[PDB]
């Protein structure tokens, strides 16, 4: 209950003081009827300045800015999760390796532009009555958060999303598909421990049964259909795949909650390896386009379940 | 669990939500095992700056600094006070008026509006006095500093300095003295006369030969307390401090009482725990009416000279009971 900011970087450590701070705060506001237009043009900003005091682990001057609290708060609450969880996610120890994870691998940090915090607005409020409708079942981003830290003045924009992956579960194969021209990974890529496979990779060389196909396929054309009607486009099918048995070489083998695990889902019966398999859209911030873009992304993705 | 700091005016939402703030925040530091040099010129400051958010109480802009908390929050543990009661006495509901007096909703804490003056004399003697504090245990009728916080609403700065109740925090007050020892006259106003609880001085007193029954035990222990006070208040440059005096008549309030639960029929007793009321004390059994009285000593930040009014202090103070 002493929490401790320490961290690798006074960064985390300010984004660990900050997530608490706001989500304190905002434990302090009651939960409104409804969200009103200026919660999505709404921000807290906060400056630290102190003197001799409490600098062991944070600096003595710094500032944290959190995006429309009363949206994200609203979001954190229809994608089941609760705010003393998150808040202890980012808190309870520094969030790991720009991509982050907590340090529970259940959230990820990433780090964004100014014109991703602006796209982000634009699109807030579209996203907001979307998750609303589809009563947070969908496979785009789930974010949580976003932040504006300012440390030795130096302003970096942070947005926190739910993982696609297991926070548990080993992933054994990253792909990341457009449906797009053509492209691949590199000899630089395909040189790493976990390499970015894409989509030449994958056509080169998915087994859910024909009811997940359906609803996954379902999913994907409505959450498709929305980023076309922002006219968004460049997203990707972030993949991963565990492979069951090879992880066997408290505990549970292809165990996992997928009340967390959102994007998880299991091999049919009848498929020649035991593996579970990661999916969710990606990149929805930042000659073709989202109609041509859109629809070409569904055949894609629909041509890569069985 | 939700607090909405809701009060008459902004500035005291502020004191709320600083309080509630650098508490918490405070306890996500770890209590040291001495207090350093550093923890007495030390300082935290927050600037809030909210936009469409948290505005139903707060105010969207504004600043709170608190004056070295680490030694704010170690005096509170040498005066039996737990952080979290501290805080919620200030953040469950609104402080209220007795700026510039106020009290929290529950009577335990004062908050005094000082000047920055003031602050920094605090400043000046906060490692003695915290010594003082130290080697007395806590025992003595010196204020209770618990806290020393400004805020900054609409440009505005405003100092306070937040005490231990020189009253009971039950016990209601039936009529209070401010007494200094000061041969030069000291009088209470027609206009503080005409007060519902009057604040009369030294001439009000002694006219009125008021005298305090506590008997010799209590008498003893609290001269010796008063002793040392002022001895320490005579080695700083300090002077023109006050004994505030408050009775509390024991069948005075069981009448009121009596008159309320008869109120709303149409529509212990003079007991008190020592160890919230510091400075309080039973009137001795053979003793006229049953009264408890409070003292404690009050003023001491901001012809005659500082060794000599402290004697002359004591000797007053030695007069005022039997």
């Known amino acids: 209950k002493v929490k401790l900011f320490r961290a690798s970087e006074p960064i985390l450590s ?9 989500i304190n705060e905002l434990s302090n506001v009651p939960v409104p009827v409804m969200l009103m237009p200026d919660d999505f043009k709404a921000y807290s900003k906060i400056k630290v300045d102190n003197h001799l005091f409490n600098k062991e682990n944070l600096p003595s001057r710094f500032k944290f800015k959190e995006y429309c609290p009363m949206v994200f708060r609203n979001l954190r609450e229809r994608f089941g999760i609760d705010d003393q969880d ?27 532009s100014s014109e991703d915090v602006a796209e982000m607005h634009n ?40 993982n696609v992956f297991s926070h548990r579960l080993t992933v054994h194969r990253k792909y990341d598909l457009k449906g797009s021209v053509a492209r691949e990974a ?8 976990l ?18 196909k359906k609803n996954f396929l379902e999913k994907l054309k409505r959450d498709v ?21 090879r992880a066997e070489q408290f505990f549970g083998p292809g165990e996992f909650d997928p009340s967390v695990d959102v994007y998880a889902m299991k091999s049919h019966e009848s498929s020649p390896k035991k593996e579970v398999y ?29």
């Open 195 to 212: 390499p970015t496979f894409k989509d030449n990779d994958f056509l080169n060389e998915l087994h859910v049964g024909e009811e997940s």
């Open 14 to 22: 300010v984004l660990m003081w900050g997530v608490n701070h706001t």
């Open 225 to 245: 259909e929305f980023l076309a009607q922002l006219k968004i486009m460049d997203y990707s099918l972030l993949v991963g795949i565990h492979d069951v048995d």
């Open 123 to 162: 699109i807030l409020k579209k996203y907001h009555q979307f998750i609303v409708e589809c009563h947070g079942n969908t496979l785009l981003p789930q974010f949580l958060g976003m932040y504006r830290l300012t440390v030795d003045g130096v302003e970096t924009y942070m947005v926190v999303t739910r």
């Open 86 to 112: 998150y808040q202890n996610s980012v808190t309870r120890s520094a969030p790991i390796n720009r991509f982050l994870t907590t340090y529970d691998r259940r959230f990820v940090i990433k780090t964004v």
């Open 278 to 306: 990661f999916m969710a859209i990606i990149d929805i911030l930042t000659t073709v386009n989202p109609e041509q873009y859109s629809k070409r992304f569904n055949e894609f993705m629909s041509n890569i379940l069985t």
């Open 186 to 193: 590199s000899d630089k890529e395909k040189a790493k421990d």
